[PDB]
PDB file of C-alpha atoms in Angstrom:
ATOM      1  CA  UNK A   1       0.000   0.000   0.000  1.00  9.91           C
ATOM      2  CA  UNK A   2       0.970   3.664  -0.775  1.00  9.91           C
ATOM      3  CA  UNK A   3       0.584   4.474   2.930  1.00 12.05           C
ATOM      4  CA  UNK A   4       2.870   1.760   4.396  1.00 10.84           C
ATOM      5  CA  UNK A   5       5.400   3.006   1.445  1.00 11.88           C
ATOM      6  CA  UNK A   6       4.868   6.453   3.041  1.00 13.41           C
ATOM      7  CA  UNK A   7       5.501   4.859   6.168  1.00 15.04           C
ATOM      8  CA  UNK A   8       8.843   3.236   4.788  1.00 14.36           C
ATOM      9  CA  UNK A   9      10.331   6.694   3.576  1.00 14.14           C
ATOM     10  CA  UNK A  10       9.784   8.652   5.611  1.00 12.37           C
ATOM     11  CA  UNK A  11      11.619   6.465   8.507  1.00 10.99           C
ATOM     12  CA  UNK A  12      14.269   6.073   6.183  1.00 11.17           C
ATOM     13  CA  UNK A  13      15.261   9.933   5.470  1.00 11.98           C
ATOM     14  CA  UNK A  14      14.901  10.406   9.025  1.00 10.85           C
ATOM     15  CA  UNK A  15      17.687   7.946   9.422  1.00 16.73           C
ATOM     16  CA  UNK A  16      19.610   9.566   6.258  1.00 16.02           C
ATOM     17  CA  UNK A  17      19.052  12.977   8.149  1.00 17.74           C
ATOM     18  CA  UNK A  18      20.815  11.864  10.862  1.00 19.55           C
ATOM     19  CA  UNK A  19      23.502   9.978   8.798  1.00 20.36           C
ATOM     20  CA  UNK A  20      23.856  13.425   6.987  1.00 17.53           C
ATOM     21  CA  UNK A  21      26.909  14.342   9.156  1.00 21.41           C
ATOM     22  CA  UNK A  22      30.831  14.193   8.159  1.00 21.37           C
ATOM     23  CA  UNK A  23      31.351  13.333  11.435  1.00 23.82           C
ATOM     24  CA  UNK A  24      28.830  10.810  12.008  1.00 23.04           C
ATOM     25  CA  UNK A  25      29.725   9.316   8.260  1.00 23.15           C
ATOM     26  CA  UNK A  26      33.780   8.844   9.519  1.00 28.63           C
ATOM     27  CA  UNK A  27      32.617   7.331  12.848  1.00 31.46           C
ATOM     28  CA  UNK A  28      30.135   5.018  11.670  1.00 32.15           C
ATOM     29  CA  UNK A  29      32.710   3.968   9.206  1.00 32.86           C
ATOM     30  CA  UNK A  30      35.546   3.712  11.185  1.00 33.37           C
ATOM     31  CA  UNK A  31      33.386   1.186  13.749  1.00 33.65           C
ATOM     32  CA  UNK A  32      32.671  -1.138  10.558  1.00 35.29           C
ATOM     33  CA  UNK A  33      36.119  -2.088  11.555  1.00 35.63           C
ATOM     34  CA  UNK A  34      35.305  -2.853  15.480  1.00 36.84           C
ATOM     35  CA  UNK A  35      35.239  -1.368  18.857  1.00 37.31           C
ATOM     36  CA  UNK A  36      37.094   1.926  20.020  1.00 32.91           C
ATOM     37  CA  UNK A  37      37.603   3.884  22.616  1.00 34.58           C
ATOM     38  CA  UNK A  38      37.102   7.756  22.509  1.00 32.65           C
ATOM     39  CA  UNK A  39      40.539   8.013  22.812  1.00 32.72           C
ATOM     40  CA  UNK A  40      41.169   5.713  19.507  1.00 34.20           C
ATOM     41  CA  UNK A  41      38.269   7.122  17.315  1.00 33.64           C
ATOM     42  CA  UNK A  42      39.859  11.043  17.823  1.00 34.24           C
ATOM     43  CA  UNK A  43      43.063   9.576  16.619  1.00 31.56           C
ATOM     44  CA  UNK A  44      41.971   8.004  13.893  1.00 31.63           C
ATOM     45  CA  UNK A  45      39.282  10.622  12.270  1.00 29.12           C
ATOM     46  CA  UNK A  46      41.281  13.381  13.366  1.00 25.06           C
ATOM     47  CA  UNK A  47      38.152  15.198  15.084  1.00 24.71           C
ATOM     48  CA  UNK A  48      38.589  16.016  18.956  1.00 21.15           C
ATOM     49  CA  UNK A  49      36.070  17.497  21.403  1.00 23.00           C
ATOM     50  CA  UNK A  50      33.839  18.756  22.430  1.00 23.50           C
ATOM     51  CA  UNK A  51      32.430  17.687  18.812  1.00 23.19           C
ATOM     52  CA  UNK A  52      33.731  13.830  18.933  1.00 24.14           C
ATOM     53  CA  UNK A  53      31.728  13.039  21.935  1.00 23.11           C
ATOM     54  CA  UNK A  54      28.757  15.257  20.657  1.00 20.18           C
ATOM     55  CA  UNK A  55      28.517  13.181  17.753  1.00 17.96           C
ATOM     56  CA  UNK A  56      28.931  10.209  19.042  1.00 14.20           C
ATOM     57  CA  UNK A  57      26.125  11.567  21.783  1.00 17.06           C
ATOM     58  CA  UNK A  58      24.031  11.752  18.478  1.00 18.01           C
ATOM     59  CA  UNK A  59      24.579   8.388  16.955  1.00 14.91           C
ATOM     60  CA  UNK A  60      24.160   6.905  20.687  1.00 14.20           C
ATOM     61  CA  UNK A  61      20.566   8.562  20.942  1.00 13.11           C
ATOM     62  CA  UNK A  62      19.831   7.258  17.270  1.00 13.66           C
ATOM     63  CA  UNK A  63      20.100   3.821  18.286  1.00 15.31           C
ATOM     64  CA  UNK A  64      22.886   3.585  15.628  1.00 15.23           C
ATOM     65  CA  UNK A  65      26.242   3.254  18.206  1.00 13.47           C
ATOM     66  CA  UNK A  66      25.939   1.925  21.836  1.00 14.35           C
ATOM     67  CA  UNK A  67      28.792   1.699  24.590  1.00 14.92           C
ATOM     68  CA  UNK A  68      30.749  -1.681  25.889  1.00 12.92           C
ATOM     69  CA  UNK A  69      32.647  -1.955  29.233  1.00 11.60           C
ATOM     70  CA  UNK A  70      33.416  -5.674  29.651  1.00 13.46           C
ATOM     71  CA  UNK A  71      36.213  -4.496  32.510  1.00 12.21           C
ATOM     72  CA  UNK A  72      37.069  -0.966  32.323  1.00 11.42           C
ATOM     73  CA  UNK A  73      37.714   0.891  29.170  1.00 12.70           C
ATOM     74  CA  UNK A  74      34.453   1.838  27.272  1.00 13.81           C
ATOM     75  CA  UNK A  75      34.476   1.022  23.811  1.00 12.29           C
ATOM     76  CA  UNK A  76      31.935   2.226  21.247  1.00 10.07           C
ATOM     77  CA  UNK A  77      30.277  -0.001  18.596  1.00 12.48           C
ATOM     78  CA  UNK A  78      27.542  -0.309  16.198  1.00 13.14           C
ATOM     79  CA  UNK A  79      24.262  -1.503  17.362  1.00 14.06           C
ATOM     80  CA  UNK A  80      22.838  -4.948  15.295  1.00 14.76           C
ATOM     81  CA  UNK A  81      19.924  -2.671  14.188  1.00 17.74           C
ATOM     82  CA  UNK A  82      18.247  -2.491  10.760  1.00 18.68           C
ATOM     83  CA  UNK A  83      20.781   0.746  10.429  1.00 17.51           C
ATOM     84  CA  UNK A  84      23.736  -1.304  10.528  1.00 12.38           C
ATOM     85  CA  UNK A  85      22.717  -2.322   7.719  1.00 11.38           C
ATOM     86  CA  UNK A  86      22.594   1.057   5.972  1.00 11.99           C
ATOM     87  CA  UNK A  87      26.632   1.872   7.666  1.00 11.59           C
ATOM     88  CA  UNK A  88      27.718  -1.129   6.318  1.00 13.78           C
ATOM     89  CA  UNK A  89      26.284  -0.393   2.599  1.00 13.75           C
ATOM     90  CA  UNK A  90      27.621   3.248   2.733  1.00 15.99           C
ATOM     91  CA  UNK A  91      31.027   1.454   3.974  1.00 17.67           C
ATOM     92  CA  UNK A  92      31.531  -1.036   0.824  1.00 17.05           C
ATOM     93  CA  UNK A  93      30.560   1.775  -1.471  1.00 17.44           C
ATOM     94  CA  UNK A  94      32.437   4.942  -0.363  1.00 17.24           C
ATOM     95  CA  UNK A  95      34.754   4.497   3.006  1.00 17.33           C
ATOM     96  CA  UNK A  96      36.532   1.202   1.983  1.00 16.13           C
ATOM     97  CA  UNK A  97      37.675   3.068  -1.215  1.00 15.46           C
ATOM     98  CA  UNK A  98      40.009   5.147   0.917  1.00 12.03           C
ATOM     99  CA  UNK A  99      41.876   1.934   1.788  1.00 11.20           C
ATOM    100  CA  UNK A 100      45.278   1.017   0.460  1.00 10.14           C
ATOM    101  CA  UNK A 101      45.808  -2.588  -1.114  1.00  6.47           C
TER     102      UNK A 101
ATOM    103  CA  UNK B   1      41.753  14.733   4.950  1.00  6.76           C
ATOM    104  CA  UNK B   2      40.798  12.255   1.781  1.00  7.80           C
ATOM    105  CA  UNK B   3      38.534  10.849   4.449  1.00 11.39           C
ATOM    106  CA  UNK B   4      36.963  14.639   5.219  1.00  8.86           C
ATOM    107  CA  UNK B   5      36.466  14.776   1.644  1.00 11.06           C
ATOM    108  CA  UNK B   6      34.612  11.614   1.137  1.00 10.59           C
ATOM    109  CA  UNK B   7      32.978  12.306   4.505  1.00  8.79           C
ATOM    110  CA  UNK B   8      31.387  15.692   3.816  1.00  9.66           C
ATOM    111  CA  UNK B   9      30.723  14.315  -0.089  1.00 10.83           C
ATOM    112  CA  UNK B  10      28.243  11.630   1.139  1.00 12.42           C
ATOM    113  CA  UNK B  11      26.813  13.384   3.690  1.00 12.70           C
ATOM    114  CA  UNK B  12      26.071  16.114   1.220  1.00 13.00           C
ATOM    115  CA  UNK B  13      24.621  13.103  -1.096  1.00 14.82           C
ATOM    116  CA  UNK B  14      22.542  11.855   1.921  1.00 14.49           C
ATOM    117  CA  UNK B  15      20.993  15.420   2.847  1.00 13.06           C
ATOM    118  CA  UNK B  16      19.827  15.237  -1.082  1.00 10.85           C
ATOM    119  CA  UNK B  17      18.232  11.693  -0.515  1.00 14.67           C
ATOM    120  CA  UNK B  18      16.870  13.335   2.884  1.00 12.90           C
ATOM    121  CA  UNK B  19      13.051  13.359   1.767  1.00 11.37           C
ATOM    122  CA  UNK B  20      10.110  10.549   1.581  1.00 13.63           C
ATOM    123  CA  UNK B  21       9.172  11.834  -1.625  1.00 10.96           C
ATOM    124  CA  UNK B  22      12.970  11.314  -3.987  1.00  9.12           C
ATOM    125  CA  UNK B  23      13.251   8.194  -1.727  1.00  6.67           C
ATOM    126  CA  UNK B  24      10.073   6.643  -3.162  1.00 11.15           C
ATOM    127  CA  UNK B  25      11.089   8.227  -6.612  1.00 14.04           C
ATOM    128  CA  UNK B  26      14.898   6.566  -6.138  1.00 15.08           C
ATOM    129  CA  UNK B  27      13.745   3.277  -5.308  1.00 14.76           C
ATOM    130  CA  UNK B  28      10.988   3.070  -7.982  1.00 16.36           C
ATOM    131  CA  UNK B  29      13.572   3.935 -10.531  1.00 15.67           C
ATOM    132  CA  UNK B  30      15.287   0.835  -9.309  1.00 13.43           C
ATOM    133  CA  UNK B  31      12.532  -1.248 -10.889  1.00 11.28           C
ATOM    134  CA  UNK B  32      12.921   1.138 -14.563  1.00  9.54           C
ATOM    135  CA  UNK B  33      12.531   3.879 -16.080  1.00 10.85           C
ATOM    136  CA  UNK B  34       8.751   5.628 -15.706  1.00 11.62           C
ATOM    137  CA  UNK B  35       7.129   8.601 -17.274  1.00 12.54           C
ATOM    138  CA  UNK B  36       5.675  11.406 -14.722  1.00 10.71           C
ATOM    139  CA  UNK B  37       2.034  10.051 -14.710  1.00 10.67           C
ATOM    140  CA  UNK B  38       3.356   6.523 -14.151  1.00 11.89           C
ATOM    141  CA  UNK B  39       5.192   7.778 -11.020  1.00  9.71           C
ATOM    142  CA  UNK B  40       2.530   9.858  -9.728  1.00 11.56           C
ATOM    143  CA  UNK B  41       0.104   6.852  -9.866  1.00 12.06           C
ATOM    144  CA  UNK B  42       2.802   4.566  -8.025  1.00  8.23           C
ATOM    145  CA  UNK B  43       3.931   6.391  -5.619  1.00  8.50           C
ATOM    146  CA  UNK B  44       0.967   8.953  -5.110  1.00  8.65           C
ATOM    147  CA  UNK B  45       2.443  12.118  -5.307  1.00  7.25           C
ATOM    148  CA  UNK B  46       0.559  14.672  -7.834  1.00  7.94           C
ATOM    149  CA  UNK B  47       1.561  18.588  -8.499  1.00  7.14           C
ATOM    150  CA  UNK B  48       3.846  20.504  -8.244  1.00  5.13           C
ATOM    151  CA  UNK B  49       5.610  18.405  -5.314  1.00  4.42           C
ATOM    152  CA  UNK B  50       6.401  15.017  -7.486  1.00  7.59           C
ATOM    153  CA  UNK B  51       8.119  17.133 -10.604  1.00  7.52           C
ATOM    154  CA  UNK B  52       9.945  19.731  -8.380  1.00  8.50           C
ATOM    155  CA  UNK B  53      11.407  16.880  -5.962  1.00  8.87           C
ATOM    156  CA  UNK B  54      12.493  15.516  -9.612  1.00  4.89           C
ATOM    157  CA  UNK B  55      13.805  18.550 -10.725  1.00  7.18           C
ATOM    158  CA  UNK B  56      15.910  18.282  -7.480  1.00  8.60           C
ATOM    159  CA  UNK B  57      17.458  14.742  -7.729  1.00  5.37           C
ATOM    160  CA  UNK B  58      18.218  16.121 -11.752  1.00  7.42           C
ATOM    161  CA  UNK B  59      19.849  19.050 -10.669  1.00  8.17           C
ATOM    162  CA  UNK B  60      21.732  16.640  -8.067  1.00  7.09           C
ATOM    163  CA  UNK B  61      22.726  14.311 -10.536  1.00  7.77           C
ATOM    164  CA  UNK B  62      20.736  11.058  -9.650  1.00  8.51           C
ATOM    165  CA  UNK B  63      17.970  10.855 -12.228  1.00  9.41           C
ATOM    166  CA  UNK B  64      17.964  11.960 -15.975  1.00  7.99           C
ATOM    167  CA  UNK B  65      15.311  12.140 -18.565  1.00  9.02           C
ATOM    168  CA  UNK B  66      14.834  10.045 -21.639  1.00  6.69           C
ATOM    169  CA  UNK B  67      12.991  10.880 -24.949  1.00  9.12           C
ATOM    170  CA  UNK B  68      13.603   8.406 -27.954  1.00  8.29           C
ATOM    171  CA  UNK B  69      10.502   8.968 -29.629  1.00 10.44           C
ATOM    172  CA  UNK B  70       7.962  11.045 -27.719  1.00  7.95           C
ATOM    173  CA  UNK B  71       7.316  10.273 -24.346  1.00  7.17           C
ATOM    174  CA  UNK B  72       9.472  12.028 -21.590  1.00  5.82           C
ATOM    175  CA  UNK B  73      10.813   8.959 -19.263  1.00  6.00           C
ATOM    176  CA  UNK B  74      13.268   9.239 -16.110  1.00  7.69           C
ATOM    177  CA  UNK B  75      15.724   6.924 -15.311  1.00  7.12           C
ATOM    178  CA  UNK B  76      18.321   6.530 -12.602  1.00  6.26           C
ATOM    179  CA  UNK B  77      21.879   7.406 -13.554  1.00  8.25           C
ATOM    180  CA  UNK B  78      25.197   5.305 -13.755  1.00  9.02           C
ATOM    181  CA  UNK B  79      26.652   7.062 -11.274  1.00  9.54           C
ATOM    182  CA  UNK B  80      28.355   6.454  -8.070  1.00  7.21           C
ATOM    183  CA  UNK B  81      24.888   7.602  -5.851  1.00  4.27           C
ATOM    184  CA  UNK B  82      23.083   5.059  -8.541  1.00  2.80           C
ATOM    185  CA  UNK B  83      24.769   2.595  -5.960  1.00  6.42           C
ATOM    186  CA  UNK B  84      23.394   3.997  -2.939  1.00  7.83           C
ATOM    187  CA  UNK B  85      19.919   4.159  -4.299  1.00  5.40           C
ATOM    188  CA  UNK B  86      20.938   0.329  -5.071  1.00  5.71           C
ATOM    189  CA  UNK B  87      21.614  -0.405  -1.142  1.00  3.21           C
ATOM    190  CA  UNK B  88      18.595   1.705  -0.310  1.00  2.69           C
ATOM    191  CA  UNK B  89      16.409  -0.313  -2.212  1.00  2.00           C
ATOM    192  CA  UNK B  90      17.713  -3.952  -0.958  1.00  4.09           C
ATOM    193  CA  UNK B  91      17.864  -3.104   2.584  1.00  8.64           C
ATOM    194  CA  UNK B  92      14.472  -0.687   2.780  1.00 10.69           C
ATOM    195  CA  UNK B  93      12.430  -0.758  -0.165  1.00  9.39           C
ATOM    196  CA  UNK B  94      12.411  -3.810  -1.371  1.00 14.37           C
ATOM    197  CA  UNK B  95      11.134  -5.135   2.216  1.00 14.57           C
ATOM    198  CA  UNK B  96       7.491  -3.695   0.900  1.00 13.81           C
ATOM    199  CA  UNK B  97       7.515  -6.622  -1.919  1.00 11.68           C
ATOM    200  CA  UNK B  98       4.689  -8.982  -1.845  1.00 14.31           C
ATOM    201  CA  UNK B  99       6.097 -12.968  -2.535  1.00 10.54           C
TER     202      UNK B  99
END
């Protein structure tokens, strides 16, 4: 039906909306690869704070990242959602391009 | 820095792809390519919103227009966002399919 179509779309730009975010794009990316700590993701992506923890803040509230502390350090991953499925899409198209052979 | 340039290039691509109505135009484009009237009946979208949020993913580069006899159809294009409107369609669109 046209309605649950409507339904559909408009969830998914919501999600692109909040996807729609240099920041959020290198970060989702980068935790493709695994779990990292605060400390590892501002090393890698080159972005420090207070932004770095405000977008991560972001993708935490979109369901899209949640935290792990198995002992002590707290590492940030991607959640098993239906969006995972979206990071790891705009991963094998765009983001793994970047990497060297 | 090539990563800040990818970075802010697809999220400029996903702010484009940001609204209900190109994403139902995107993902029926998927499927072929469909005159204005066709996708107004499919996706239920009349005047003036369904051919200005066209005009939009034109000027952006996503969809093109066809004409080789008469009838104006648009079509996806070959390029790189073609494959995001690709991964759009498998993991969202495509879910609305009846077996």
């Amino acid at each position: 039906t046209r309605e649950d179509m409507e339904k559909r779309a408009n969830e998914v730009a919501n999600l692109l909306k909040t996807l729609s975010h240099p920041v959020r794009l290198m970060l989702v990316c980068t935790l493709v690869e695994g779990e990292f700590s605060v400390g590892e993701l501002e090393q890698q992506i080159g972005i420090g704070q207070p932004t770095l923890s405000q977008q991560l803040g972001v993708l935490r509230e979109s369901g899209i990242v949640e935290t792990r502390r198995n002992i002590k350090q707290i590492f940030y991953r991607l959640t098993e959602a239906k969006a995972a499925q979206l990071v790891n899409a705009l991963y094998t198209i765009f983001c793994a391009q970047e990497k060297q052979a």
